[PDB]
């Protein structure tokens, strides 16, 4: 096989024309069991018991519903394109709005395959473990830390965090130790970030969200 050979400049529009691709691809020279038989195991039987799979149903419902037409779209959730807000980047500081951790400030880790943001606050700072969160319920601050050359374990997929009393397994505890062990030194790099991450966001008698800068 080969690459697309047609660089895309606009969604659904190729760079090269129909006749241009004829030359580039060089078409001017490149032209042209239901049933199984098994023995029975008894004499005067014949050993010719032909058995068929997918046998006829033993019961039919009184009425059936007709099948629906075709849609040429509406892909299942597993293959939807994951869209990430431009202000979200690895290492930025986020604010939780709806969960048990309302107002907590956390540092954004890798984004997962389901589109949920794998995020963590340093568990020694705000008692927030490695959790998934939705970008639509998170406010992005302009404060960023460099989480490059930081190793996130490969086994932190969505299935890892999917729900099954809750007990903290050792694997959750060990994985938490590994990640923050290399995150905290970067937290200490810039001053006063501990107090920023420890405190919670809240609205007061003054400021309004549409005037604030994030």
């Amino acid at each position: 096989p080969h690459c697309s050979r047609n660089p895309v400049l606009v969604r659904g529009i190729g760079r090269y024309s129909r006749s241009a691709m004829y030359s580039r691809k060089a078409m001017y020279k490149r032209k042209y069991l239901a049933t199984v038989t098994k023995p029975v195991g008894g004499d005067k039987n014949g050993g010719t018991r032909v058995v068929k799979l997918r046998k006829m149903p033993r019961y039919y419902p009184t009425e059936d519903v007709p099948r629906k037409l075709l849609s040429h779209g509406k892909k299942p959730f597993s293959q939807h394109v994951r869209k990430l807000r431009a202000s979200i980047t690895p290492g930025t500081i986020l604010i939780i709005l709806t969960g048990r951790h309302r107002g907590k400030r956390v540092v954004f880790l890798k984004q997962l395959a389901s589109g949920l943001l794998l995020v963590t606050g340093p568990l020694v700072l705000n008692r927030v473990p490695l959790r998934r969160t939705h970008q639509k319920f998170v406010i992005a601050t302009s404060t960023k830390i460099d989480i490059s050359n930081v190793k996130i374990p490969k086994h932190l997929t969505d299935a890892y965090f999917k729900k099954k009393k809750y007990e903290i397994t050792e694997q959750r505890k060990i994985d938490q130790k590994a990640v923050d062990s290399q995150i905290l030194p970067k937290i200490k790099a810039i001053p006063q970030l501990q107090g920023y991450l420890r405190s919670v966001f809240a609205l007061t008698n003054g400021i309004y969200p549409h005037k604030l800068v994030f």
Partner: protein, 47 residues
């Protein structure tokens, strides 16, 4: 886009040509503007 093509197949070529033409024209404007900027500090040193 695909609906438009089923009525006017030629519209694909016009759209492709327009995008390519504007990409070239946008490129041409940003060098001579840079050349004018490249002229500014040329007179800043020679003075």
């Amino acid at each position: 886009l695909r609906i438009m093509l089923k009525l006017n197949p030629y519209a694909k070529t016009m759209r492709r040509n327009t995008i390519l033409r504007q990409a070239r024209n946008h490129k041409l404007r940003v060098d001579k503007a840079a050349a004018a900027a490249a002229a500014l500090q040329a007179k800043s040193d020679e003075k």
